[PDB]
């Protein structure tokens, strides 16, 4: 098994997204707060892809299960065969 891989999202990686967002100054206690928001968005999406991928008797996640899961939450995504 693999553990504590949440620390792969580094401080420069988080700050680069904020730069694109538009902010100018970033407080110290933002990185830990942000790492806890991405870890929750990735459970809701994946728990539906896994539900889709086992009702079809398969044991490999495809690129269509993710699109369906994203569509079920009002987040439709164009470009991957939807």
């Amino acid at each position: 098994v693999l553990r504590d891989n949440i620390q792969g999202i580094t401080k420069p990686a988080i700050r680069r997204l904020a730069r694109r967002g538009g902010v100018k100054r970033i407080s110290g206690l933002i990185y830990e707060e942000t790492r806890g928001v991405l870890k929750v968005f990735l459970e809701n999406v994946i728990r539906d892809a896994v539900t889709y991928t086992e009702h079809a008797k398969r044991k490999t996640v495809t690129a269509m299960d993710v699109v369906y899961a994203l569509k079920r939450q009002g987040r439709t995504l164009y470009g991957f065969g939807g």
Partner: protein, 96 residues
């Protein structure tokens, strides 16, 4: 010793990163995270490359769109620095 004023360099990175379209997180570190999370619902599972790429393409948009709205709550309170109490308010007003 030619230094810059504290903020003129950060004001240029916004222009640099609002003009290019590319992924901002490292592919292998992001891909390991998905495999770690998705081993609790069902063990010994497999992924396509496109599934991981599509999962990464949406988190970027989500985080970027979230960092745009937390920058308005900081402006509302007469600030330029964004504190953790802005992310909570922005996330609570839209219901999540």
């Amino acid at each position: 010793p030619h230094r810059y004023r504290p903020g003129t360099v950060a004001l240029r990175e916004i222009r640099r990163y609002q003009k290019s379209t590319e992924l901002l997180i490292r592919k292998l570190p992001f891909q390991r995270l998905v495999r770690e999370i998705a081993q609790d619902f069902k063990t010994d599972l497999r992924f396509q490359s496109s599934a991981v790429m599509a999962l990464q393409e949406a988190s970027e948009a989500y985080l970027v769109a979230l960092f745009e709205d937390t920058n308005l709550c900081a402006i509302h309170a007469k600030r330029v620095t964004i504190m953790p109490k802005d992310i909570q308010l922005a996330r609570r007003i839209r219901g999540e």
